Write a protein that binds this ligand. Structure first.
Ligand SMILES: CC(=O)N[C@H]1[C@H](OC[C@H]2O[C@H](O[C@H](C)[C@H](N)C(=O)O)[C@H](NC(C)=O)[C@@H](O[C@@H]3O[C@H](CO)[C@H](O)[C@H](O)[C@H]3O)[C@H]2O)O[C@H](CO)[C@@H](O)[C@@H]1O
Ligand code: CA
Length: 142
């Protein structure tokens, strides 16, 4: 029924080497995007994650999949943004994933036309002040 949108590239303002952003769109729920393990800085958060499609595309909802074992980096408070040209970004919604260990779905009020999505991760679960991590990020159209 629903169509999954292909993520072709992305960026992360913080990553641990070997755990860069593309590990969250490789289709494998065991591989992780993971922010830098050096999480002691006062300005460590927020962490900004950008997911890019090939072209502007119709999108109706997204699903964030946290790591399915371990508690380091489960998203908590975020701002979700998107962009129609990959450069200029528009606030979509504030979403609090609550540090949940299960998938978090966000359904948009209306279909949006996006080439890119961006997550401003303000907080995340884990040791110390927390981390940001993601097993898979998915985007769908109805
Ligand atoms: C024993 C020790 O050094 N404890 C310190 C504590 O370490 C936090 C650390 O604990 C576990 O890791 C151990 C060091 C060891 N490698 C192990 O496997 O037991 C956690 N691993 C597991 C499987 O539970 C570590 O989780 C990892 O953390 C990474 C980020 O650092 C990343 O998120 C990985 O994905 C994740 O598996 C981690 O929790 O740290 C405290 C304070 O920070 C210190 O006081 C202890 O001495
Ligand atoms: Ca993955």
């Amino acid at each position: 029924g629903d169509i999954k949108i292909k993520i072709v590239s992305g960026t992360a303002s913080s990553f641990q080497s070997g755990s860069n952003i593309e590990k969250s769109f490789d289709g494998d729920y065991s591989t992780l995007y993971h922010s830098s393990w050096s999480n002691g800085a006062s300005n460590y958060f927020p962490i900004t994650l950008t997911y890019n499609f090939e072209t502007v595309t119709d999108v109706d909802y997204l699903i964030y999949h946290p790591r399915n074992n371990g508690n380091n980096g489960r998203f908590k408070e975020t701002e979700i943004q998107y962009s129609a040209d990959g450069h200029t970004f528009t606030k979509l919604i504030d979403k609090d994933f609550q540090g949940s260990a299960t998938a978090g779905k966000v359904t948009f009020d209306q279909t949006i036309q996006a080439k890119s999505f961006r997550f401003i991760v303000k907080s995340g679960s884990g040791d110390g002040q927390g981390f940001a991590s993601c097993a898979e990020m998915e985007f769908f159209a109805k």
